[PDB]
Amino acid sequence: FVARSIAADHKDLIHDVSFDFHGRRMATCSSDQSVKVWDKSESGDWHCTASWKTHSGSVWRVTWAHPEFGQVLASCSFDRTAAVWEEIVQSHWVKRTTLVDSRTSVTDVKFAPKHMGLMLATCSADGIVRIYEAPDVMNLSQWSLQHEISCKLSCSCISWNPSSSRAHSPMIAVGSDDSSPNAMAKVQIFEYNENTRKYAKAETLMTVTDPVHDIAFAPNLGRSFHILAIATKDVRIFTLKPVRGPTKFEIHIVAQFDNHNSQVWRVSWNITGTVLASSGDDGCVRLWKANYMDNWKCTGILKG
Amino acid sequence: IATKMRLRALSRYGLDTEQVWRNHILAGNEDPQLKSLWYTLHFMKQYTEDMDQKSLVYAGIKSIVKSSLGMVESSRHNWSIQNLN
Amino acid sequence: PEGLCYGLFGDLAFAAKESALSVFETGMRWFVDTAERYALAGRPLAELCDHNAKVARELGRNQVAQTWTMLRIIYCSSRLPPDFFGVLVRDMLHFYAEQGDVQMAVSVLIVLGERVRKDIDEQTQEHWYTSYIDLLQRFRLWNVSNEVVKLSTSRAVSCLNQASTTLHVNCSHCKRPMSSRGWVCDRCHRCASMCAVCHHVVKGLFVWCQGCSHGGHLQHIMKWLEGSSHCPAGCGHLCEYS
Amino acid sequence: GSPLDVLKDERVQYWIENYRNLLDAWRFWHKRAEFDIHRSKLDPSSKPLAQVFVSCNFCGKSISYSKVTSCPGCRKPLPRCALCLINMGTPVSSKDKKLAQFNNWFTWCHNCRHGGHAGHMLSWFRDHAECPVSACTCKCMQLDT
Ligand SMILES: [Zn+2]
Ligand SMILES: [Zn+2]
Ligand SMILES: [Zn+2]
Ligand SMILES: [Zn+2]
Ligand SMILES: [Zn+2]
Ligand SMILES: [Zn+2]
Ligand SMILES: [Zn+2]
Ligand SMILES: [Zn+2]
């Protein structure tokens, strides 16, 4: 890989970077209460086309929505709010709705896949994962809270299941970064059941007891089982194979990498869900790929 | 007249409003009536612009001189404008 | 203190504590070319298979090319059983789908049509079609996505194109709706579909400004807006400002 | 700059219409459009050619001139492009940014009424020759020429 730097000009540390659906746009949120949207031209240079103050406290996560709903950004911050930003055409970004249901800091915010409509999930530090919905995609100023899930642990990361199949029920994983001395599972997986119309805890990953800083479901893309990547003191990849009430999965760990030799903060799959990038405290990005024998191996080490 | 109209349209005849008098050049041929008409239109446009800077002119001489009252004809042609109405 | 995310085209943004924003650019060019230069219908099965195999061999995907040729031999042929290879074709489709190559599976499904459609369940076919369509739309390949939708063997995927794509047009002079298959006004008895440029009836494609409510032939309006910034009908509207 | 009484006279407008008909006979369509712009600038009484407009499927009111992809009247979603499946729309209100580029204009076949963005359908009918909407056999571009 060929590395190139970008003059972020952010007054504080950049907490999250999220590409758009088409890959042509970028959104970076930092601790300076600023979210910057970068659009690249034919020259290949990323130009900061927008930079506006968003929240009162540090902004943790910024996520994009599917373009059929328009250029929509959701940002969670330290001020217990998850704001939804829409672009109106110069390039002006307006705040649509401030989600103030959480009584504590909202660690992560993530848009649900396209086939669910325009649904938003926010996880708070008190163990409550709130799932929102916009009944009218043309009116983004009205969001109705559909479900709220108590995860009994300080949530730090969520990841929707990007499967578009009708054979896979809606599924959201919740990771916890709590560092209690007791050994309890730090990742809980909730599956929406159509019969009860309520999210229920389907599978729990007991093997993960270290604090979790990032989780990322692999893009399904024609597969039959679900692959989950977890960021901890090491890098773990779990495969969720449904069996023929919540669905029961034959959970098998297929990767465990300590090549970072430190805490791993972020995990991000590619578009095909075949190469996983892990960023740890070592400041290196390690791309992990699986051969035809399901032996995950590092295909490159990338340094700043 | 049809071929002349085609040629004038190809040369953007009559579409120049910067100074209208040049339109008769765009007419292709030396037409005295066209030149006179376009020069008159340019003169009246110039008068309108000057009046705006510091309607009735477009009404023509007949309407302009209809209100021209109080002139004394000169009996003797002395051989040597502002005294006019 | 770190952020990480791949883009669509293989580029990877990595922002960590010093914070420095770095985009680690490289990927899927083969996918774009393969989607662009297959033919999925309009030719016999043998011709389609040879064309797709030639594409795969040109792009360097020897296994895909041999798979296409094998499909041609299996289907477009004291003989083998009629359904001898159906299980193997299903297994090949699942093998290509489970490794992320949904493009090949969908292309084979479309080319074969009913010869393998009745053997793969509807839910998995729909999942493959939607995944391939999402991949195509990400790369902004609308033509290939729409071709897949039109040629989709699944009714649900085919119906994805007919949702709210019908426009109700009215005559400006009469302010009343027009016929669904018409080019003349029902009430005013006027050719309301006249092109603003050529003043001829626009029977086919009509492009329409939303500001001045004027338009005409798609090519004619394109050329006029390339040559000027005013409305062709002459309403003092800069339709496409600058 | 003639007075409105002169411009409203039947003879003057008849001469103008005859000249425009002559320009159409010679296929001087662009020059006729330039003359139309000139006439509209100089004579405000010259009503421009009345052409079709799109109406919202639910409200029924004209969508011509705050989400762009929503009907201005009833806030309902606008018809979506048959190719990108994104709801069509165009913001309404020089060497500046084109607020409404041509490739985003409403465009539909006047026969089957199936519509899409101008650039999208232009590319599609440059490649193919059938209506993008499924189960439609109309040859949209072949109808014009
Ligand atoms: Zn009418
Ligand atoms: Zn035309
Ligand atoms: Zn107009
Ligand atoms: Zn216009
Ligand atoms: Zn409406
Ligand atoms: Zn479109
Ligand atoms: Zn049609
Ligand atoms: Zn048509």
Q: Which of A68, A89, A139 sits opposite D86 (nearest CB)?
A: A68
Inter-chain residue contact D1 with B6, CB threshold 8 Å: no
Run of H or E residues at A175: strand A171-176
The helix/strand/coil state of A73 is strand
Per-residue CA distances from A108 to A87, A213, C159, C233 (Å)? 22, 10, 36, 53
Distance between CA atoms of residues C89 and B40, nearest Å: 87
- For residues C105-127, one letter each, b for 16 or more C-beta atoms within 10 angstroms of the residue's C-beta and e for the rest, the string is bbbbbbbbeebbeeebeeebbbb
Residue C50 burial (10 A CB sphere; 0-12, 13-18, 19+): middle
If you measure from the C-alpha of residue C163 to the centroid of ligand 8, how many angstroms do you get, rounded to a whole number?
Answer: 16
If you measure from the C-alpha of residue D56 to the centroid of ligand 4, how many angstroms do you get, rounded to a whole number?
Answer: 19
Q: Contact, D31 vs B5, CB < 8 A?
A: no
Q: Contact, A259 vs A285, CB < 8 A?
A: no
Calculate the CA C142 to chain-centre distance.
Answer: 4
If you measure from the C-alpha of residue C176 to the centroid of ligand 5, how many angstroms do you get, rounded to a whole number?
Answer: 15
Residue B84 burial (10 A CB sphere; 0-12, 13-18, 19+): exposed
**Which tokens go with C81?**
């059983």
Distance between CA atoms of residues C138 and A221, nearest Å: 13
**Which tokens go with A57?**
């406290």
Distance between CA atoms of residues D57 and A256, nearest Å: 55
Q: Contact, A212 vs A186, CB < 8 A?
A: yes
Give partners of C (≥3 CB pairs < 8 A).
Answer: A, D
Minimum CA–CA partner of C95 in chain A: A223
Strand partners, A16: A29
Enumerate residues 6+ apart whose C-beta is below 8 A from A188: A151, A153, A173, A174, A176, A201, A204, A205
HSE-up (13 A, CA, CB side) for residue D1: 16
Q: Contact, A6 vs A36, CB < 8 A?
A: no
Q: Which of B83, A35, D109, A96 is nearest to C193 (CA)?
A: D109
Cα torsion at C56, C61, C65, C68 (round to 10°)?
Answer: -90
What 8-state DSSP symbol labels residue A186? S
Residue D72's φ and ψ, nearest 5 degrees, are: -60, -30
Task: Name the residues around ion ligand 8, CB cutoff 5 A.
Answer: D 109, 111-112, 131, 138, 140
The helix/strand/coil state of C43 is coil
Inter-chain residue contact B45 with D1, CB threshold 8 Å: yes
Work out the angle at residue A278's Cα, subtended by the Cα atoms of residues A275 and A282, and round it to the nearest 5 degrees.
145
What 8-state DSSP symbol labels residue B57? G
Alpha helices in chain B (DSSP H): 2-10, 23-26, 32-53, 60-64
Q: What are the contacts of B41-50 at 24+ separation with CB within 8 A?
A: B45/B20, B45/D1, B48/D1
**Which tokens go with A11?**
């007054």
Q: Contact, D104 vs A89, CB < 8 A?
A: no
Inter-chain residue contact C21 with A19, CB threshold 8 Å: no
Residue type, C216: G
Q: Which of A3, A115, A163 sits opposite C22 (nearest CB)?
A: A3
Work out the angle at residue C69's Cα, subtended by the Cα atoms of residues C66 and C73, and round it to the nearest 5 degrees.
135
Residue D82: its chain C contacts at CB < 8 A? 146, 161, 165
Q: Which of D67, D97, D99 sits opposite A138 (nearest CB)?
A: D67
Q: Which of C53, C7, C58, C38 is nearest to C144 (CA)?
A: C38
Residue A136's φ and ψ, nearest 5 degrees, are: -115, 110
Enumerate residues 6+ apart whose C-beta is below 8 A from C45: C72, C75, C76, C111, C112
